[PDB]
Subunit: 399 residues, 3 copies
């Protein structure tokens, strides 16, 4: 069929894909549009990228639904370790597989911009665009990669439904993936590492599914940033280095069955009246020393809650930071800060820390329940408007 393209064998290209794969892909998209010319004759296409090192000089603009861009794998290599190592005898020093080196010279910072102008009720949304099994690489960057090199991998900037980002590698980018106005996006089985931020769901979103990923962005950005997100599902991910899942006015999220690790506070922040979110069956680990930052102090919380009726159940909170490195100096670090809101619920969580640490209930909070989720020594309730059923501990009395 004429809907199958390979960037290296398609003869209609006027530049080599090794020189500018962005120009080649744009030319393929123009070819698709010349063949798929009515609303009932636009099934889309597949563009295959074989293993190779490809420079991208021109931003790709996708306004075609059902476009699949696929390669041979995620191609990750730790450029951060490379850049701290003596690499003269390394067998390879670049990420690989189907490897796009993001090198725009066109005044734009995105390798891929997925965007259609118009009112969605009038022109239709972008639907079921698929990025699978290729590598996007910013080539050179320094920690924490934000602002860094300013480069973005994939950015969706118009309303979209059922998009799919699967099996990819993203490395050395300021922003790996940005999706504005996402409805039911599927972000799964990716390897995002050594980037400023990993996933940003901007504007608003409905029922995003973020599953089975490695998310390894650093401490200036977010692993998952979600603005006005309804119904987010975040599960089965390994989120490392500077795990930071921030919801701003997000509700009815399900954040379950993840491995979550940071060298910094704010592993989950439910901000700006984020309510009825579940945080269940996750392992949280806070450590120190893989980078340092004062973006947050240790009173911010491993989990920070500003909202109502959230549920924190069945998790482990494991904290190991040397006392001399805790901030503000001399203070007890915070495991969960319930900063504001009503009827939040913590139950059946185990808190293990190298120094005394606290669940803090701000004086403004109401009806918070803390049920086998803190010993007496682990609760710092700044209002009497809470219910405590303590995790058992000894020495209630002094004599």
């Amino acid at each position: 069929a004429d809907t199958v393209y390979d960037v290296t064998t398609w003869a209609g290209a006027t530049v080599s894909p090794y020189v500018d794969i962005g120009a080649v892909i744009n030319q393929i998209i123009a070819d698709i549009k010349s063949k798929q010319t009515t609303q009932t004759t636009r099934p889309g296409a597949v563009i295959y990228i074989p293993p190779g090192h490809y420079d991208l000089l021109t931003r790709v603009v996708i306004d075609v639904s059902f476009l699949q861009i696929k390669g041979a794998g995620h191609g990750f290599l730790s450029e951060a370790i490379r850049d701290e190592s003596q690499t003269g005898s390394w067998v390879e020093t670049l990420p690989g597989a189907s490897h796009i080196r993001v090198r725009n010279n066109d005044g734009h910072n995105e390798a891929f911009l997925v965007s259609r102008t118009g009112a969605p009720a009038t022109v239709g949304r972008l639907n079921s665009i698929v990025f699978q099994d290729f590598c996007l690489d910013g080539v050179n960057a320094s920690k924490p990669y934000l602002p860094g090199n300013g480069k973005t991998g994939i950015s969706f900037q118009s309303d979209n439904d059922a998009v799919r980002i699967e099996g990819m590698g993203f490395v050395y980018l300021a922003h790996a993936l940005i999706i504005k106005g996402a409805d039911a996006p599927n972000i799964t089985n990716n390897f995002i590492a050594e980037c400023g931020s990993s996933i940003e769901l901007t504007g608003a979103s409905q029922v995003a599914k973020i599953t089975n990923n490695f998310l390894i962005s650093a401490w200036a950005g977010y692993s998952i940033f979600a603005e006005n997100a309804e119904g987010l599902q975040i599960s089965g991910n390994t989120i490392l280095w500077a795990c930071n899942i921030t919801l701003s006015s997000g509700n009815r999220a399900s954040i379950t069955s993840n491995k979550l690790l940071s060298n910094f506070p704010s592993q989950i922040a439910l901000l700006n009246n984020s309510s009825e979110n579940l945080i269940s069956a996750n392992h949280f680990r806070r450590v120190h020393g893989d980078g340092t930052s004062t973006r947050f102090d240790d009173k911010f919380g491993m989990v920070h809650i500003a909202g109502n009726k959230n549920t924190v159940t069945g998790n482990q909170f494991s904290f190991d930071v040397p006392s001399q490195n805790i901030t503000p100096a001399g203070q007890d670090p915070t495991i969960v800060l319930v900063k504001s809101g009503d009827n939040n619920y913590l139950a059946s969580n185990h808190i293990t820390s190298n120094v005394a640490a606290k669940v803090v209930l701000d004086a403004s909070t109401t009806a918070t329940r803390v049920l086998h989720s803190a010993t007496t020594a682990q609760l710092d309730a700044l209002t009497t408007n809470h219910f405590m059923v303590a995790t058992p501990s000894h020495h209630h009395h002094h004599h």
Copy 2:
């Protein structure tokens, strides 16, 4: 190798795949069987479907193990939204990618029937058939799509082992996926929406794995129906619109780490003595208005339990239905109905509701434990044969 076929380039096809891809696939299957003729020379084949709009007029019948049918993506477009919109200027109005329009003219309702004749002990089960990354579309349908247009995407009707349905799109079908007599089926990473039912595991099943899907079927059918299911695993799914997971004599299921939402009751129903099932670390949301139905009233439960020794832990039950729309009128809605059974266990669940709502223990139940899973006001126990450790209030 000659085991790789593309429906648009295979020279043996006597019909265009755009006109009837079902006939083309059946011709390929006949070719495979002509070349793979003994029990040690049947490795199977791959059929690739490039992006395109393909009509299916003839049901495909598969009795070949290790057949992979694969395309370029799930291809979903909301035909429900399209059908309530003014679409003259829409850039596209059809689902796409590798897009099969299910339009049988042969009197059958399935696009794909996977079925082998004979006793499995004598002829073997069907093994490791793979459907990946294509779109099955019923073309025209009206809510709630059941009975709807009567169309079925894929139906497995004989005993099978290790089948795999991955990365697919299904839309505007009465039944997206039906698997009878499945052992270790893998149903993962799919997008099933605007269908009557999404997944039906019929007859019986053993250790089915249903993970990482979007399931968005409507209120007359089931998101997941499984009868005589041993060991079902359901995790990592986003199940929306009319989430309804019904187990009929299902035991030892693990239903965990899902996002579950419905505009109707019966988000999970453990029916016909379904026992020793785990429901843990799920977010449940009940809302109202995206369709209406009287199939269940609000006393049925967001979770409904008829069975023994089930375990409900670490979930949120979030309920928001205007009082004037609650049924029966004026009555307190039910979060969990323990309808019958012994030694069921509810612990460490948070119930948040816009009106007073209850966990109801039917008078026939025995030894139910409700442990930090309901305040006193949230328990309506109709038998003293239970144990309550109240969520404080």
Copy 3:
């Protein structure tokens, strides 16, 4: 591009891949090395294996980063059932899809050895090698398959980063997958069954991700074995027959949202000071009779803990073993054995058993908390140094 190879069509092959696919893949790798000759010109390659039956006689050695070897599916057929059946009329008797019959005659046990010698700081690690959607088969084996036929599917024996094993089938091997010194491996969506052991992470590992697999190895080995593992994530798996997840000096693991079943003790063993590991939202089922062993007796535990500060929350422990088969004879079997360690935490778990069964706290343990995770009758505390908040009875 010349970085794409098919073992059945590549013109450089001097051996048939059906006779020795190992030789053909080794020849492809030599070709890759001849074309990709500097540290900035080694993007790797893809090797496609179409459906077919291929013997492997020569071990493949991979020391090239970013090599993908991919086929048409997992190809599983239950050879165990075949070998106890009358198969004269079976339509197929062999696993299929892209099917490698592991038949080494070169003095080695592995089909694939992934190894780069010499110091990772000097030569680099092996990075992002991908095995996808093919079948590795030991051809003939007898239960429990370990030591069995001695055959290994894939063995990584040098430090590696971001490797990926996805969608594969492994059957009738002593060891399906071994990875030594793994950093962020991704082992996902596989079907590993009727093998001695399924996944072994040796030496040490960091942040392995094991998700969405069927793991069906038998009772002499391990479903998942990990030594010196930091941060292992195990979730969404269906682990059957002889589920045994053993961590030796493993810490900060997250073992959640799995369906876990064994006919034997030791479904999870946290051994040799394994600490701060989470076991949450899993369904555990212990049954008897699908094979028998005296490797462990029933006092070992469904879960066995030797370490500190672990967390066991929101699970079901379902135990069904006839009293006549429980060992030591006449003794109550153990659900969770806290063998040694400090500050372990059990909360909101439901224990259901056909006979009296216990959480046992060894006399050496300190500060164990057991909170709505055992009735009084289900706790056998052999030290007064614990906290009990009983499940009501």
